[PDB]
Amino acid sequence: ASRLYTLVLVLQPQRVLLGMKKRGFGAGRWNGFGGKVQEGETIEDGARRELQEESGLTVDALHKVGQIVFEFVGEPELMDVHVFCTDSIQGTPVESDEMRPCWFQLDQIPFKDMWPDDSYWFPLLLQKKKFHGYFKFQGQDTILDYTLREVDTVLEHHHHHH
Ligand SMILES: C[C@@H](Oc1cc(-c2cnn(C3CCNCC3)c2)cnc1N)c1c(Cl)ccc(F)c1Cl
Ligand SMILES: [Zn+2]
Ligand SMILES: [Zn+2]
Ligand SMILES: [Zn+2]
């Protein structure tokens, strides 16, 4: 099957808010906010819930800017990653036990300290281009293949449990 995930980028005109994973899986890397969508909540609920827990921020709105599929050789469960961005935050960013938010100038993004697929789709998100992406991995993050398309509009999946 697949597992449903959200990824949220807080993107203001000249800077982006990323979070460093503090402990555990993927520790020491910077990424957007998000996580697994739980049963009982919609995709948008999960994205809002993760951003609140990981950064302490509330959002007025989330823009659907991308979809990514992660596939790992051996695992029959793909990752269905719904990607959102937003520039209408409320509150002050404050770390959780899991993530610490920090602002980054758009021309100083630390790609070497982020997940490898970010080097592909993150520049498209930075240029306000919507995208559909697929990445096949082996191991933690070794890309075997990928395809990345710019889209006019992000296609809806019509998840009826989320
Ligand atoms: C923050 C982000 O980091 C990534 C994790 C992964 C990832 C997560 N898990 N794995 C595998 C590690 C071992 N093999 C099974 C999963 C790779 C791939 N690309 C990423 N950008 C991430 C994570 Cl950590 C989890 C779910 C997501 F939808 C996203 Cl977008
Ligand atoms: Zn479900
Ligand atoms: Zn946006
Ligand atoms: Zn989906």
Side-chain angles (χ1 to χ4, degrees), residues 3-97 99-148 150-158:
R3 208 187 303 196
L4 180 50
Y5 288 86
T6 61
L7 189 56
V8 178
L9 284 307
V10 175
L11 175 57
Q12 285 180 353
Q14 337 228 0
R15 55 180 193 173
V16 60
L17 189 75
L18 301 165
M20 173 177 50
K21 192 68 180 78
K22 289 166 61 182
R23 103 221 118 166
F25 180 80
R29 274 177 163 168
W30 297 94
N31 36 260
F33 305 96
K36 182 178 158 75
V37 178
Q38 301 165 5
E39 303 303 313
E41 70 180 354
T42 69
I43 295 170
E44 207 195 65
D45 297 325
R48 291 178 181 261
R49 179 184 54 73
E50 292 289 348
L51 180 70
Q52 164 58 241
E53 297 174 352
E54 302 166 354
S55 72
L57 298 182
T58 301
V59 284
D60 296 338
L62 290 170
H63 325 134
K64 307 180 181 179
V65 294
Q67 298 285 334
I68 311 175
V69 175
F70 293 150
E71 173 160 41
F72 305 87
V73 293
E75 186 189 43
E77 168 166 306
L78 307 200
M79 290 185 36
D80 173 22
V81 186
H82 289 242
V83 186
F84 300 91
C85 59
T86 175
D87 64 338
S88 60
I89 53 171
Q90 256 79 39
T92 161
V94 70
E95 59 195 275
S96 69
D97 288 278
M99 295 262 289
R100 183 177 300 113
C102 186
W103 287 107
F104 289 81
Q105 289 295 100
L106 292 181
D107 64 341
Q108 297 291 311
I109 303 310
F111 289 105
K112 60 178 182 177
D113 300 312
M114 303 164 69
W115 288 81
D117 49 278
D118 293 37
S119 284
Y120 298 77
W121 58 264
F122 199 38
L124 304 186
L125 186 152
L126 290 189
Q127 287 178 57
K128 300 304 185 171
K129 320 299 183 183
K130 303 179 185 172
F131 56 90
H132 286 165
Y134 165 82
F135 298 81
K136 176 145 68 175
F137 290 91
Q138 75 172 9
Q140 297 303 321
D141 53 15
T142 300
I143 290 168
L144 292 191
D145 192 29
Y146 80 98
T147 133
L148 195 42
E150 171 170 8
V151 293
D152 197 23
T153 159
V154 169
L155 256 296
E156 165 79 25
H157 289 172
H158 301 97

